[PDB]
Amino acid sequence: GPGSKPFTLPILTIGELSNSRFPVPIDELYTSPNEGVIVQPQNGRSTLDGELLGTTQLVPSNICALRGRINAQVPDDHHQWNLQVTNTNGTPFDPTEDVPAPLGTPDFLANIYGVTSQRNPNNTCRAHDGVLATWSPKFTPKLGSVILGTWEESDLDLNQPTRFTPVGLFNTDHFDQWALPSYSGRLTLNMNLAPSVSPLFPGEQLLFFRSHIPLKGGTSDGAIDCLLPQEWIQHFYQESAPSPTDVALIRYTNPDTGRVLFEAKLHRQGFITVANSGSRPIVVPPNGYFRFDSWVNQFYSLAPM
Ligand SMILES: C[C@H](CCC(=O)NCCS(=O)(=O)O)[C@H]1CC[C@H]2[C@@H]3[C@H](O)C[C@@H]4C[C@H](O)CC[C@]4(C)[C@H]3CC[C@]12C
């Protein structure tokens, strides 16, 4: 009946899923206590009924991308360029909109390696590799501007359409996947944030969809953990199915036999918990996927993984 459209998950195996916090495929499922850290990502956030939260948007190639025009080079460091940002879909950025930053803006501290490209009205073009430092005092996307750094010191034009394509980490300096940038810079609080998430029942931990992103030099697992894959967010946005309780019970199922491997709790706020203790990667059957079973409550006791 009206108000009771059945909730569903898309039929997608792990090799058919994308990270919602960096534009790469999912590599594995992962669980960890993250004891003492506040888990509050702003990309990859949606309710189960299809309301996108934080800085989350639908287009996979706009995750961690920037668009705008360069108004000036920094006089005393010609490696630095001031980018006046627009939205990644091309529309002007309205700082009065009730979001933390332009949709798709990176949600973690890092030196992000990527490429800055331009095309002029006469179709002359240029591109140069470089670094987006999301920890810099000049990373102020909510105010409309960020700094780009490049090895190139001359061949970028002012007042021409510009895009930043992210590739990975440049190095590990300042890298912390759970530390949010200060979107308006020094001494100013972030606004309109999606809330932090945590397990709320003893014996449970968050379950993440993990990718190991590229690193240009150094030592790191490159781990970026998202709460929901991008395809699930895209599915819920189209379906708009109401949530009648706080938690959907989901089961990882092999479709050819019906055998169920393990179960988990999918919370209406858009994250997963499992009964497990300790940090561990999981291996799933390549042909399996999560399926909706029933609606339960916050206090339902799961079978341990
Ligand atoms: C402009 C960026 C942030 C600088 C910053 O805010 N520093 C802090 C100033 S304060 O002490 O807080 O006042 C810096 C951080 C990393 C820098 C880059 C990296 O060091 C790698 C590259 C090094 C090359 O010598 C120049 C280009 C190269 C690509 C740099 C350009 C400028 C970057 C991108």
From TrEMBL:
<keyword id="KW-0946">Virion</keyword>
<feature type="domain" description="Calicivirus coat protein C-terminal">
    <location>
        <begin position="85"/>
        <end position="305"/>
    </location>
</feature>
<keyword id="KW-1035">Host cytoplasm</keyword>
<dbReference type="GO" id="GO:0030430">
    <property type="term" value="C:host cell cytoplasm"/>
</dbReference>
<dbReference type="GO" id="GO:0044423">
    <property type="term" value="C:virion component"/>
</dbReference>
<protein>
    <submittedName>
        <fullName>Capsid protein VP1</fullName>
    </submittedName>
</protein>
